[PDB]
Design a protein around this nucleic acid. Structure first.
Ligand SMILES: [K+]
Ligand SMILES: [K+]
Ligand SMILES: [K+]
Ligand SMILES: [K+]
Ligand SMILES: [K+]
Ligand SMILES: [K+]
Ligand SMILES: [K+]
Ligand SMILES: [K+]
Ligand SMILES: [K+]
Ligand SMILES: [K+]
Ligand SMILES: [K+]
Ligand SMILES: [K+]
Ligand SMILES: [K+]
Ligand SMILES: [K+]
Ligand SMILES: [K+]
Ligand SMILES: [K+]
Ligand SMILES: [Mg+2]
Ligand SMILES: [Mg+2]
Ligand SMILES: [Mg+2]
Ligand SMILES: [Mg+2]
Ligand SMILES: [Mg+2]
Lengths: 66, 91, 100, 99, 129
RNA sequence: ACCGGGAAGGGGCGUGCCCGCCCGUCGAACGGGGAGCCGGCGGAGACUCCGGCAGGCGCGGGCGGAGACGCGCCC
RNA sequence: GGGGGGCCCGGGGGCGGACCGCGCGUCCCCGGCCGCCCCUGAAAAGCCGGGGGGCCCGCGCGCCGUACCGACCGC
RNA sequence: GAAAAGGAGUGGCUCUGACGGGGUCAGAACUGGAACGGACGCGGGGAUCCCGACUGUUUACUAGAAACACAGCGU
């Protein structure tokens, strides 16, 4: 498991390296499940909004707060 | 202040083994614990590592020598004689 | 023999009293490269590779090089030190002559 | 409380490759974790000192770049030894040809 | 008696990536601070075996650098260089110059090799037999 | 049955060349030896199951620094 | 010595994986030294470096042990 | 030889000083059947003679020694 900067995150998205994304509410955690590692990014909700506006439609995103 | 009068380093033996043996060991053990002058290093750093093996702790040469001293008298004399015999073989 | 060695003693003393000199191999090399070294003077137990390169550098510099006829301890004593000295380089001779 | 643990290995004979340390787990438990022996690093062929630049990891787990140094005789000689060899070769050439 | 570090002298390299390789003193630098240095052009790669029965094989790789003189060993040998004319201040920290400088010195070294010049300079020193 | 080197002692490949002096895949569940952690579930098993997160070994679609140093194979 | 650097260091911290301080001591491992020997404290498979010369995504990981016990030997 | 032989103190409570948070060491007043290592743990001592120098070993199951070994000495 490891942490990632958002532009590398979009590289991963745009070259189809992820199988599922998770949004965790708490500062929001974005969790990306790739072949090798699980990558995590932490952004405020304002930035989560635009990252998901930019989210991929070949990409299953699932929400989570509890 | 001085701690023993005569026994020196043989005070480790206590009252055991008799006078003649302890007298011999004082001499032997002082000789084998001494520091010697490195014939290359130029410095007085040679210590014994095994019975006939002496290492200079500064320049790190190893040398073959006596059991309890770095040089022996027979070897001094032999080396002098062999050097003289060589020189006589140079015309 | 005795006359010559006592002259060597007197000149080493004069150089260290009034003159320019260096003790040590690294300074000896730097000065021989520059060509500031009137004389170079070694000990009989100088390490042989170091001796080879000193003699070669001196052959290219035309700096004369001699041998002290005593250990590095002896050279330390002779220039007035408590430590061993493999090379002494004499840069200016002062009130000495360097006739050796 | 009671923090006593049982042995983790096949036998309990405590040789130098069967050493553990202790650590607390997220489930509030005292667990044993093996302590690998640490291999030495390569040493100089001429003087026997640790070669500078190589980590103490078996080379099977290191990439090629990490297992080397960038100099002639990079991982074999320490550099003082290399200098001494170069000087020996050149000066001996000089004293064997032209007197 | 006389200085040895002069701008035509051939040295052996002692430390760094090019240790035990021959080079020429392109220039000598003064002694202000940090010590004593010299612009030096040297051979990084020599050509190789060419049977009768080849450009890549017979190409020649050089290097120019400023080096500490304490890391050099002078020689009797000498190479009458033509590189003083080529500007020696743009060599350093001006990389755009330095790559083209290496190109224009590679060509010349291969040329000297073709005309069979400086046998001692273009031969390899035997180490650690 | 016991004892033992002085024997024309095997390999690479790709034909035809080239290299070669002569043993045991016997002998250690404590020596050497690539690579594992957490949470959970059962009447009886778990570093072995299940979930999660990793690691190892395999197979298929020439540059920088003054320098100490930094950043595909085969014999 | 002083000033500035390089490499190793079974460790620690921050982010991931996912309540707050302060102490003496014990056990274990590690470090640099110092002492000792008419005592000097295994080997090999396997893996790698040097010199010289010639030239990301998928799939898999076979065989055997594994319950329990001082329930063992002394009728 | 030696802990030779022989003497004296030691609880509780209230205080004081010394060492850079931490206990130790030193000192004083008061007090208790004329008590204090209050259980527990824990040498009796000395004057001599014989044998073997010493640490070590032995008749598993009636003998641990003055017997064997030993460094040293000699052939
Ligand atoms: K028979
Ligand atoms: K076997
Ligand atoms: K075996
Ligand atoms: K075993
Ligand atoms: K085994
Ligand atoms: K090599
Ligand atoms: K089991
Ligand atoms: K009291
Ligand atoms: K007895
Ligand atoms: K005893
Ligand atoms: K006894
Ligand atoms: K009996
Ligand atoms: K008995
Ligand atoms: K007894
Ligand atoms: K007895
Ligand atoms: K007996
Ligand atoms: Mg094992
Ligand atoms: Mg069980
Ligand atoms: Mg079990
Ligand atoms: Mg007895
Ligand atoms: Mg009996």
């Amino acid at each position: 498991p490891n942490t990632i900067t958002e532009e590398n995150l979009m590289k991963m998205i745009a070259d189809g390296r992820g199988k599922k994304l998770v949004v965790k509410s708490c500062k929001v955690k974005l969790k990306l499940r790739t072949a090798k590692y699980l990558y995590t990014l932490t952004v405020p909700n304002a930035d989560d909004a635009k990252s998901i506006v930019k989210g991929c439609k070949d990409k299953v995103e699932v929400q989570y707060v509890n | 202040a001085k701690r023993t009068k005569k026994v020196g380093l043989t005070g480790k033996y206590g009252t055991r083994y008799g006078r003649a043996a302890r007298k011999q060991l004082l001499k032997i053990e002082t000789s084998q614990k001494a520091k010697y002058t490195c014939p290359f290093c130029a410095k007085d750093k040679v210590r014994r590592t095994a019975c006939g093996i002496w290492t200079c702790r500064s320049c790190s040469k190893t040398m073959a020598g006596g059991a309890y001293s770095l040089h022996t008298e027979p070897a001094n004399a032999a080396r002098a004689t062999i050097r003289r015999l060589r020189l006589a073989r140079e015309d | 023999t005795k006359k010559a060695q006592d002259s060597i003693s007197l000149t080493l003393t004069l150089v260290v009293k009034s003159g320019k000199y260096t003790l040590g191999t690294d300074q000896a090399i730097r000065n021989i490269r520059d060509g500031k070294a009137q004389l170079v003077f070694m000990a009989n137990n100088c390490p042989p590779l170091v001796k080879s390169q000193v003699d070669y550098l001196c052959h290219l510099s035309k700096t004369p090089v001699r041998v002290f006829a005593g250990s590095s301890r002896e050279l330390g004593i002779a220039v007035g030190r408590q430590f061993n000295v493999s090379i002494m380089t004499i840069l200016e001779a002062g009130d000495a002559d360097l006739t050796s | 409380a009671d923090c006593r643990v049982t042995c983790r290995f096949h036998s309990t004979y405590r040789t130098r490759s069967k050493i553990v340390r202790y650590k607390r787990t997220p489930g509030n438990r005292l667990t044993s974790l093996r302590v690998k022996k640490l291999p030495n690093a390569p040493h100089c062929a001429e003087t026997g000192k640790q070669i500078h630049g190589i980590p103490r990891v078996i080379p099977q787990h290191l990439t090629r770049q990490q297992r080397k140094v960038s100099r002639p005789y990079g991982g074999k000689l320490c550099g003082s030894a290399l200098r001494a060899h170069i000087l020996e070769s050149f000066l001996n050439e000089e004293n064997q040809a032209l007197r | 008696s006389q200085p040895i570090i002069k701008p035509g002298l051939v040295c052996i390299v002692l430390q760094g990536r090019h240790a035990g390789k021959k080079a020429v003193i392109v220039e000598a630098l003064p002694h202000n601070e940090r010590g004593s240095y010299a612009i030096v052009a040297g051979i990084a790669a020599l050509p190789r075996r060419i049977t009768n029965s080849a450009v890549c094989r017979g190409r020649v790789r050089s290097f120019v650098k400023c080096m500490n003189v304490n890391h050099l060993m002078p020689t009797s040998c000498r190479l009458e260089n033509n590189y003083k004319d080529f500007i020696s201040t743009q060599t350093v920290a001006d990389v755009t110059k330095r790559r083209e400088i290496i190109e224009t010195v590679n060509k010349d070294f291969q040329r000297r090799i073709l005309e069979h010049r400086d046998t001692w300079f273009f031969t390899k020193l035997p180490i650690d037999a």
